[PDB]
Amino acid sequence: TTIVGVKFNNGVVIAADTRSTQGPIVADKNCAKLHRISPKIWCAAAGTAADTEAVTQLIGSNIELHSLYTSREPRVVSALQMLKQHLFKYQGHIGAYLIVAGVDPTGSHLFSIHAHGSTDVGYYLSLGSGSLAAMAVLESHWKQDLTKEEAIKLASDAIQAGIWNDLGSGSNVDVCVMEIGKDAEYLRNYLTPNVREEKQKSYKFPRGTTAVLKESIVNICDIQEE
Amino acid sequence: MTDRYSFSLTTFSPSGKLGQIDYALTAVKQGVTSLGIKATNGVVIATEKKSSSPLAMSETLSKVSLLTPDIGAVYSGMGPDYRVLVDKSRKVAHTSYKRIYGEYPPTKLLVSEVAKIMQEATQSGGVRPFGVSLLIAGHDEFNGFSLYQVDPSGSYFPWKATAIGKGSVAAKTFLEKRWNDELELEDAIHIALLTLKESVEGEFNGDTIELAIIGDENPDLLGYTGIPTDKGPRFRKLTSQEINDRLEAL
Amino acid sequence: TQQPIVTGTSVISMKYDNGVIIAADNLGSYGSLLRFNGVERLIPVGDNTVVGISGDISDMQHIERLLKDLVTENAYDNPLADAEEALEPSYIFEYLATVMYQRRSKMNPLWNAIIVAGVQSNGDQFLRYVNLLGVTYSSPTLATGFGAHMANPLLRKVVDRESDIPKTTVQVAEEAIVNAMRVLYYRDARSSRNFSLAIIDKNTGLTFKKNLQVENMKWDFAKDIKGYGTQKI
Amino acid sequence: TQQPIVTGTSVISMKYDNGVIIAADNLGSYGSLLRFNGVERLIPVGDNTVVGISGDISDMQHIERLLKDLVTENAYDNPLADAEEALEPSYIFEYLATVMYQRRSKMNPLWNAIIVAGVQSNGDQFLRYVNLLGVTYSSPTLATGFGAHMANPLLRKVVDRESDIPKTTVQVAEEAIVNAMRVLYYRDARSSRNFSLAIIDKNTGLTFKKNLQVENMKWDFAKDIKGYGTQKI
Amino acid sequence: SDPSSINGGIVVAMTGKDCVAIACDLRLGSQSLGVSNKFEKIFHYGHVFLGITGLATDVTTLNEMFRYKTNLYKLKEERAIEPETFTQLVSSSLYERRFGPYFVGPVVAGINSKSGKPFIAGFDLIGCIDEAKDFIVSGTASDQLFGMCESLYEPNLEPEDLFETISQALLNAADRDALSGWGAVVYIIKKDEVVKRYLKMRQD
Amino acid sequence: QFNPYGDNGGTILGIAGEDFAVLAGDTRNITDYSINSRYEPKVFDCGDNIVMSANGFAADGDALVKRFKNSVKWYHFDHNDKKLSINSAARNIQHLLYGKRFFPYYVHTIIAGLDEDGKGAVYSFDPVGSYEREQCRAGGAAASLIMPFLDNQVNFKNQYEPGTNGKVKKPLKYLSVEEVIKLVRDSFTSATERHIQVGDGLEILIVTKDGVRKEFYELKRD
Amino acid sequence: TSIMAVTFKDGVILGADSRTTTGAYIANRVTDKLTRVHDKIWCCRSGSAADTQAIADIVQYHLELYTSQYGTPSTETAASVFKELCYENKDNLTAGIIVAGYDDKNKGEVYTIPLGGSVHKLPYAIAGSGSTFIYGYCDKNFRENMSKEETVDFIKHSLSQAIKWDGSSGGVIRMVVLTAAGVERLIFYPDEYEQL
Amino acid sequence: TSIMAVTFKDGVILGADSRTTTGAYIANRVTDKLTRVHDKIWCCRSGSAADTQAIADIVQYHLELYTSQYGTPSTETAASVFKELCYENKDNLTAGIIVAGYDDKNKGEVYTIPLGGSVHKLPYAIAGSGSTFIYGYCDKNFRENMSKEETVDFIKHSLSQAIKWDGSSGGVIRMVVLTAAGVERLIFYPDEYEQL
Ligand SMILES: *C[C@@](C)(O)[C@](*)(O)[C@H](CC(C)C)NC(=O)[C@H](Cc1ccccc1)NC(=O)[C@H](CC(C)C)NC(=O)[C@H](CCc1ccccc1)NC(=O)CN1CCOCC1
Ligand SMILES: *C[C@@](C)(O)[C@](*)(O)[C@H](CC(C)C)NC(=O)[C@H](Cc1ccccc1)NC(=O)[C@H](CC(C)C)NC(=O)[C@H](CCc1ccccc1)NC(=O)CN1CCOCC1
Ligand SMILES: *C[C@@](C)(O)[C@](*)(O)[C@H](CC(C)C)NC(=O)[C@H](Cc1ccccc1)NC(=O)[C@H](CC(C)C)NC(=O)[C@H](CCc1ccccc1)NC(=O)CN1CCOCC1
Ligand SMILES: [Mg+2]
Ligand SMILES: [Mg+2]
Ligand SMILES: [Mg+2]
Structure with missing residues (x-):
């Protein structure tokens, strides 16, 4: 997986590739790794896929209840604190490595969190198997006072580096932009540089090609009247 | 330093009460x-904001509460009992439904869970029943729009329209005359404001009335864009200004 | 079977229109200890070849002596030793690749990763890799260790395929190499600031640059980073 | 189950005619690193008992707090806390011995060897050992770690059996202890020159000596030692 | 020793034009010994179909578990569970055994009764969801099924064409796996009719 | 401890026609999750109208090909420039592989060419030298993905004549070179989608009576 | 990691490098290892990033609750809370922490807590992988009652050497000054400290 | 073991501690780790006592035979013979050797040979377990072209610190001075160097 976060002038952008794997096999070519914790707090996930989903949903559920209880819009530091304490308690066994970003009344924020429960602060971050390829691009092109357009460009370029150079990553680039005083914009399949070419041949079979022993109707309906 | 009240404090009297x-x-x-x-x-659900003091900021006390994005609740009775029930209702919507099925519960089942909590306070050891009746309005895909009442016993009933508390007998009669099965939402808000004016003594405006609707999806209130299936909350609390506009055409 | 003791980190390289560039830092690490700060890991062979070596330094010094002895041996009874029968990059590589695979096959490897960079007689660019296992491969960009993970992505943005090689000048290619060395200094815990760089061009020959430093570093944003989440000061 | 981290070496001790002497150096080692040079490992309890501790220093500090808390607890509702119901060496020892054996039996030991030295109410000398396993024993001389191997042989030349105790004065006994500490500094790689010594006498009470140094060392013969056999210069 | 390959078996699912297909082999074994040639791996709860590969005791246990849960769902909700909702229920149920998991590879298939939209999904043993447009594979010949599906599949196939494609994907994948085969079943699922077909295949 | 083996990934495919044979291989070379090269040739013209590939651990693969190429050279010297037949090449390769029975070459080898009757031939080897002639074979990382497809599309397995209930099999046919190359390209496009170690490029060597021809096609680079 | 805390005339100064490692990869080059547990009680962190963060978060909680009930805690008290957590959970923790603070009564104090969970009060302390390389240097160059400028230079020169020789240390040198005057943050970049 | 060799204006000086350990027992407290392989080529030994003695004995033999045939060997040549033995027998040896010598042509030279059997020519070198604690100190205090008295003090102060912090080092500080003037042996006792 390749996931990144990049801060800019008036907010923060996160991005991710869309490949999930099972051994050396690609299980899903259009995986969604940008998870919504709350409307303006989103995070990118790497690691054990079930764990990242379960952990984002649990903390996202508890963040929603906390928001209703306090009559306040959720804060990124709260999502961070609740995620790290949960992951620390499980001593690394919950294999969730996350980049947590968002906007709240305090401002815009960008953090990373690792499976053992350590967190870090930064203006640019990368995680997953393609994090070295992505960090190379980030270390070469990042500057202070980036615009929205520049940060989206830099984030997607950093994912592309992971797509092309890391065998763990591939397919498409997903982006989510969180700007202060605006709705968060989730851009699913922001780039699509890996469409399969047309096949040489059609493999549609003639009807009757497969040998059958028995046919029967399956009753899916409930017990009937009369 | 022991809870020795392991016995019921609600029991049957000789008359069966x-x-x-x-x-x-x-x-x-x-x-x-x-x-x-x-x-x-x-x-539509509605109630009077009975302010305990004019120095008190009645905006901070929310009698009408969001439970899920498509379900809202209002009450009559003891306010603190209502507040803790709203906390528990919000939580049980997640724990016993959303964390299992990945979607919010339908109105009737969330009502059922709240009802269960109120029944248990009517039978468990060392507790009194909740001193509230709830009105829960909601929407879900397969049942459509619905309105439920929940009483201290845990019993619940679906209503086309109803009222509870102080002037409920008079208010229910008023609603029987005005209600029909062809009402639009604006017509129901208009009837809600007329019905509520009868039971209010003092000031009657957007600052002393609390009103919310379960209506169309509000994508502008969602807080994010990019997922076509997530179209926004159907619950919306009407503002002080929005209420006053409809009071001029009253 | 052994374990590497004193070690050298990444060697990085690429092809450009008229030749090849190769680079490596001047460090010999002793585990986490940054023990030796003046170690040259680019070793020229003649005026047309540079062998860049990472991994065990004792084994590097052995390989250095093999190459030095190879030049001596090639000169024997060879009136064209400085002309048509001079050592080629392809000859030097194949020799090393033979030795590497023979040593792994005796379960006593030379614990190194090697990149041979040079220009052939006909002006063709030569760039090929070999390691302790005898595994060999060629590509428009090549890098060992951390450089494979971090330098290659950056260098491949300049030369992504064979057809990009004629379009890439020596200035653009050197710039890419120098930037890649900075990125490795930010991110590799067993790297140093000081490095050597070698250009082998078909026209201008062998240019060997010593005592280079990583410069134009960005650390200023560090002042604004406080705590690990909730700390405000 | 754990492993000891910061550690203290030998504690040595002996009986003499009117009391007991105990000593230990002021070092807290971190493996081969001689990390902490001001660590007190003799801890007095009242005016009649000194507990000398070796092994894990974190566990030593825990034991120190247990003893401090034991004095506080003994004073509670006790008008004779500074007289007939004061803590005795035998009471302090049995408490520690109980704790040590309980902790080993839960597979979570206090990783220490302990010598309790003192004088009882009736003037009798008290000297007894306990360790991480709960093993206990008494003898006219006692020592932990390297001290068992090197100090005991020397101290047993002064008091070889019970009948030698009345014949041994405080000057002779202290001299033997000070010499033993020098021998340990020559020969124990995890020792220091600086040490503390405590005398508990039935007449003169508790005398606690800090900041002592090993002195009168012989190193001069070292100049004459050259090579390892055949070297003459 | 590896619980996921003691008994053997496979499941594959595919989408078509206004239809879905789900298919499985019939083998149950104890490593090299073939025991049963009638061990079906596809179950249904109303109109939602579930295939399960892996350790056979857990296949049976999970069928009984999801029958239990979907029966209670229907009593309370007063409607049949949909594929999208059932998928989430499978995921929730698997993940609650995170550190002592069921050794299984489940596959959901069905048509949403309201929207009419074809739906398939797959899961790992701890409940991660793969919601594919095209196809889902599972079992000891999953590599083989991935290869067959990725080449043979095209979108928007009619029900009777989709039958041929999924059958050929299953059969040829099974014949390259020692622990799969011994018969096969194919379900063709449309909005209000479901046809079940037993395939003639080689019995080794 | 020192491990003398490694895995360089890659995937290869041999198909035999009536008067031709193809040997195809992807051009990607990898270790762990890194790409070493996007174009590192893996299928080689060995002379005498024989093409060879030894996929797996690339160092052992290169060593084996190098030794076989040399075996062809010395076969010419020792037997009066006689053409090494494909069957004879195969038996020679068995002895090269079995020579290292207790320290194997970690490769799956395929050779292709024409037999002594001019008919297309593909031979396939395990690491220690067991071999068999076949119409079809895929080897390497994505062999498990590709082989079942070839069983179905080259040898017509599990396919029957429509309307015969299920009792007349689809009759076996030789495929044209145009039809084989279509199956090769689709096999590798499919493998590239689902296997991380497969990609970058496809290089096909085609062997006929006229000689050895090459074709190259781009594959996805992710 | 290279960390140190040094008492001086006007108070105490904490210092650290900014490197976080996963194997030989530098996961964070601008890490802040100097963390606030109270207004004028800070700590230097070394060992596991997860463990030392978890501990520091718990200590910050304990001292916030101490302050609500009993007023400002002493540096000794803060060190005791760190110790209790490190000692009692010694089997499950990898944490090497230096605690430093300023009282008006006690002035500057430094407590070091190594792996076992022992406590040691010292005039100055050094810790982390890179500290091994500067025991010699620090012992020869430390004096008591130094000025602020002298103590900044002592830490800058010391950590410069620790960074130079330890591959696990690097980046910027962060410092935190604790005096009666308040809390001052200082940063020193490679171009400054490498040429020393 | 703590060992070093330092080039200076008039030549080179070798230094060492005198401790030999079996576990934590000090088997020899007056060890001589500075060994002659030729009149003016000496070495500092660290690692296995058996291995470094065996190697040094073989090197002394090789250089004696070199001298009989070809005259006085260079320091570089002596270092090469050490290297050959250490490199080729790397699997079976635990030897860390510093080679130091004086020519009239080349003046003072120092070569260090660590565990792998690599060679490194340096202005000065440090090695052994106790050297880790003085990298900082030695880097800050070494200058080229020092006087004899300055270089004796530099080694005395350096090994003093190495001894202070390393339990595996101790005893006396032995030194051997190599100049045109000849070969001088120096010894420094604990009472002298501890108070520095
Ligand atoms: C791909 C990536 C570049 O690594 C990136 O990090 C993504 C990010 C996700 C999608 C948010 N990660 C994955 O795709 C993981 C990689 C991974 C695999 C294995 C362990 C840890 C990480 N992929 C998955 O988690 C994968 C998702 C499926 C394909 C939908 N699940 C598995 O591979 C599963 C993990 C099981 C497991 C159990 C306990 C601890 C950790 C992991 N393994 C299997 O399914 C293997 N096997 C099980 C028995 O049946 C046959 C298959
Ligand atoms: C740099 C320094 C000298 O070590 C200094 O002490 C810093 C101080 C921190 C920033 C407060 N320490 C680190 O950087 C630690 C060093 C360390 C590693 C492992 C155990 C203890 C200490 N680094 C981390 O804690 C690191 C932070 C992540 C990258 C955000 N975590 C790990 O490396 C993680 C720790 C697992 C662990 C935890 C506790 C005890 C034992 C092990 N380890 C991995 O992820 C292992 N890694 C190995 C290579 O393949 C990938 C997995
Ligand atoms: C002190 C120093 C810093 O280590 C310094 O390098 C000196 C330099 C010498 C004097 C030239 N080195 C020693 O003192 C070595 C340290 C060492 C120990 C073990 C392996 C390598 C180095 N000490 C010895 O060589 C020691 C000399 C004897 C006492 C005369 N020999 C041993 O300790 C012996 C070595 C066995 C061995 C040899 C080579 C590789 C691995 C092991 N070991 C024992 O006798 C073990 N001993 C353990 C405790 O129970 C008794 C048996
Ligand atoms: Mg089979
Ligand atoms: Mg990729
Ligand atoms: Mg010492």
């Missing part, structure tokens, strides 16, 4: 009037 439930219903009768009306394309 459960005294504490009846007495809880009496507490609900003393409470401020609240109502609910169901339209074809929506549901």
Whole structure:
């Protein structure tokens, strides 16, 4: 997986590739790794896929209840604190490595969190198997006072580096932009540089090609009247 | 430093009455009037913001509460009992439903869970029943719009329209005359404001009235864009200005 | 079978229109200890070849002596030793690749990763890799260790395929190499600031640059980073 | 189950005619690193008992707090806390011995060897050992770690059996202890020159000596030692 | 020793034009010994179909578990569970055994009764969801099924064409796996009719 | 401890026609999750109208090909420039592989060419030298993905004549070179989608009576 | 990691490098290892990033609750809370922490807590992988009652050497000054400290 | 073991501690780790006592035979013979050797040979377990072209610190001075160097 976060002038952008794997096999070519914790707090996930989903949903559920209880819009530091304490308690066994970003009344924020429960602060971050390829691009092109357009460009370029150079990553680039005083914009399949070419041949079979022993109707309906 | 009250504090009397439930219903009768009306394309719930002092900021006290994005609740009776029930109702919507099925519960089942919590306070050791009646309005895909009442016993009933608390007998008669099965949501809001004016003594405006609807999806209130299936909350609390606009055409 | 003791980190390289560039830092690490700060890991062979070596330094010094002895041996009874029968990059590589695979096959490897960079007689660019296992491969960009993970992505943005090689000048290619060395200094815990760089061009020959430093570093944003989440000061 | 981290070496001790002497150096080692040079490992309890501790220093500090808390607890509702119901060496020892054996039996030991030295109410000398396993024993001389191997042989030349105790004065006994500490500094790689010594006498009470140094060392013969056999210069 | 390959078996699912297909082999074994040639791996709860590969005791246990849960769902909700909702229920149920998991590879298939939209999904043993447009594979010949599906599949196939494609994907994948085969079943699922077909295949 | 083996990934495919044979291989070379090269040739013209590939651990693969190429050279010297037949090449390769029975070459080898009757031939080897002639074979990382497809599309397995209930099999046919190359390209496009170690490029060597021809096609680079 | 805390005339100064490692990869080059547990009680962190963060978060909680009930805690008290957590959970923790603070009564104090969970009060302390390389240097160059400028230079020169020789240390040198005057943050970049 | 060799204006000086350990027992407290392989080529030994003695004995033999045939060997040549033995027998040896010598042509030279059998020519070198604690100190205090008295003090102060912090080092500080003037042996006792 390749996931990144990049801060800019008036907010923060996160991005991710869309490949999930099972051994050396690609299980899903259009995986969604940008998870919504709350409307303006989103995070990118790497690691054990079930764990990242379960952990984002649990903390996202508890963040929603906390928001209703306090009559306040959720804060990124709260999502961070609740995620790290949960992951620390499980001593690394919950294999969730996350980049947590968002906007709240305090401002815009960008953090990373690792499976053992350590967190870090930064203006640019990368995680997953393609994090070295992505960090190379980030270390070469990042500057202070980036615009929205520049940060989206830099984030997607950093994912592309992971797509092309890391065998763990591939397919498409997903982006989510969180700007202060605006709705968060989730851009699913922001780039699509890996469409399969047309096949040489059609493999549609003639009807009757497969040998059958028995046919029967399956009753899916409930017990009937009369 | 022991909880020794492991026995029921609500029991059957010789006449077959459960005294504490009846007495809880009496507490609900003393409470401020609240109502609910169901339209074809929506549901409205409403109540009076009875301010305990003019120095108090009545905006901070929310009698009408969001439970899920498509479900809202109002009450009559004891306010603190209502507040803790709203906390528990919000939580049980997640724990016993959303964390299992990945979607919010339908209105009737969330009502069922709240009802269960209120029943248990009517039978468990060392507790009194909740001194509230709730009106829960909501929408879900397969059942459409709905409106439910929940009493201190745990019993619940679906309503086309109803009222609870202080002037409920008079308010229910008023609604019987005005309600029909072809009402639009705006017509139901208009009828809700007319019904509620009868039970209010003092000032009657957007600052002393609390009103919310279960209506169309509000994508502008969602807070994010990019997922076509997530179209926004159907619950919306009307503003002070929005209420006053409709009071001029009253 | 052994374990590496004193070690050298990444060697990085690429092809450009008229030749090849190769680079490596001047460090010999002793585990986490940054023990030796003046170690040259680019070793020229003649005026047309540079062998860049990472991994065990004792084994590097052995390989250095093999190459030095190879030049001596090639000169024997060879009137064209400085002309048509001079050592080629392809000859030097194949020799090393033979030795590497022979040593792994005796379960006593030379614990190194090697990149041979040069220009052939006909002006063709030569760039090929070999390691302790005898595994060999060629590509428009090549890098060992951390450089494979971090330098290659950056260098491949300049030369992504064979057809990009004629379009890439020596200035653009050197710039890319120098930037890649900075990125490795930010991110590799067993790297140093000081490095050597070698250009082998078909026209201008062998240019060997010593005592280079990583410069134009960005650390200023560090002042604004406080705590690990909730700390405000 | 754990492993000891910061550690203290030998504690040595002996009986003499009117009391007991105990000593230990002021070092807290971190493996081969001689990390902490001001660590007190003799801890007095009242005016009649000194507990000398070796092994894990974190566990030593825990034991120190247990003893401090034991004095506080003994004073509670006790008008004779500074007289007939004061803590005795035998009481302090049995408490520690109980704790040590309980902790080993839960597979979570206090990783220490302990010598309790003192004088009882009736003037009798008290000297007894306990360790991480709960093993206990008494003898006219006692020592932990390297001290068992090197100090005991020397101290047993002064008091070889019970009948030698009345014949041994405080000057002779202290001299033997000070010499033993020098021998340990020559020969124990995890020792220091600086040490503390405590005398508990039935007449003169508790005398606690800090900041002592090993002195009168012989190193001069070292100049004459050259090579390892055949070297003459 | 590896619980996921003691008994053997495979499941594959595919989408078509206004239809879905789900298919499985019939083998149950104890490593090299073939025991049963009638061990079906596809179950249904109303109109939602579930295939399960892996350790056979857990296949049976999970069928009984999801029958239990979908029966209670229907009593309370007063409607049949949909594929999208059932998928989430499978995921929730698997993940609650995170550190002592069921050794299984489940596959959901069905048509949403309201929207009419074809739906398939797959899961790992701890409940991660793969919601594919095209196809889902599972079992000891999953590599083989991935290869067959990725080449043979095209979108928007009619029900009777989709039958041929999924059958050929299953059969040829099974014949390259020692622990799969011994018969096969194919379900063709449309909005209000479901046809079940037993395939003639080689019995080794 | 020192491990003398490694895995360089890659995937290869041999198909035999009536008067031709193809040997195809992807051009990607990898270790762990890194790409070493996007174009590192893996299928080689060995002379005498024989093409060879030894996929797996690339160092052992290169060593084996190098030794076989040399075996062809010395076969010419020792037997009066006689053409090494494909069957004879195969038996020679068995002895090269079995020579290292207790320290194997970690590769799957395929050779292709024409037999002594001019008919297309593909031979396939395990690491220690067991071999068999076949119409079809895929080897390497994505062999498990590709082989079942070839069983179905080259040898017509599990396919029957429509309307015969299920009792007349689809009759076996030789495929044209155009039809084989279509199956090769689709096999590798499919493998590239689902296997991380497969990609970058496809290089096909086609062997006929006229000689050895090459074709190259781009594959996805992710 | 290279960390140190040094008492001086006007108070105490904490210092650290900014490197976080996963194997030989530098996961964070601008890490802040100097963390606030109270207004004028800070700590230097070394060992596991997860463990030392978890501990520091718990200590910050304990001292916030101490302050609500009993007023400002002493540096000794803060060190005791760190110790209790490190000692009692010694089997499950990898944490090497230096605690430093300023009182008006006690002035500057430094407590070091190594792996076992022992406590040691010292005039100055050094810790982390890179500290091994500067025991010699620090012992020869430390004096008591130094000025602020002298103590900044002592830490800058010391950590410069630790960074130079330890591959696990690097980046910027962060410092935190604790005096009666308040809390001052200082940063020193590679171009400054490498040429020393 | 703590060992070093330092080039200076008039030549080179070798230094060492005198401790030999079996576990934590000090088997020899007056060890001589500075060994002659030729009149003016000496070495500092660290690692296995058996291995470094065996190697040094073989090197002394090789250089004696070199001298009989070809005259006085260079320091570089002596280092090469050490290297050959250490490199080729790397699997079976635990030897860390510093080679130091004086020519009239080349003046003072120092070569260090660590565990792998690599060679490194340096202005000065440090090695052994105790050297880790003085990298900082030695880097800050070394200058080229020092006087004899300055270089004796530099080694005395350096090994003093190495001894202070390393339990595996101790005893006396032995030194051997190599100049045109000849070969001088120096010894420094604990009472002298501890108070520095
Ligand atoms: C791909 C990536 C570049 O690594 C990136 O990090 C993504 C990010 C996700 C999608 C948010 N990660 C994955 O795709 C993981 C990689 C991974 C695999 C294995 C362990 C840890 C990480 N992929 C998955 O988690 C994968 C998702 C499926 C394909 C939908 N699940 C598995 O591979 C599963 C993990 C099981 C497991 C159990 C306990 C601890 C950790 C992991 N393994 C299997 O399914 C293997 N096997 C099980 C028995 O049946 C046959 C298959
Ligand atoms: C740099 C320094 C000298 O070590 C200094 O002490 C810093 C101080 C921190 C920033 C407060 N320490 C680190 O950087 C630690 C060093 C360390 C590693 C492992 C155990 C203890 C200490 N680094 C981390 O804690 C690191 C932070 C992540 C990258 C955000 N975590 C790990 O490396 C993680 C720790 C697992 C662990 C935890 C506790 C005890 C034992 C092990 N380890 C991995 O992820 C292992 N890694 C190995 C290579 O393949 C990938 C997995
Ligand atoms: C002190 C120093 C810093 O280590 C310094 O390098 C000196 C330099 C010498 C004097 C030239 N080195 C020693 O003192 C070595 C340290 C060492 C120990 C073990 C392996 C390598 C180095 N000490 C010895 O060589 C020691 C000399 C004897 C006492 C005369 N020999 C041993 O300790 C012996 C070595 C066995 C061995 C040899 C080579 C590789 C691995 C192991 N070991 C034992 O006798 C073990 N001993 C353990 C405790 O129970 C008794 C047996
Ligand atoms: Mg089979
Ligand atoms: Mg990729
Ligand atoms: Mg010492």
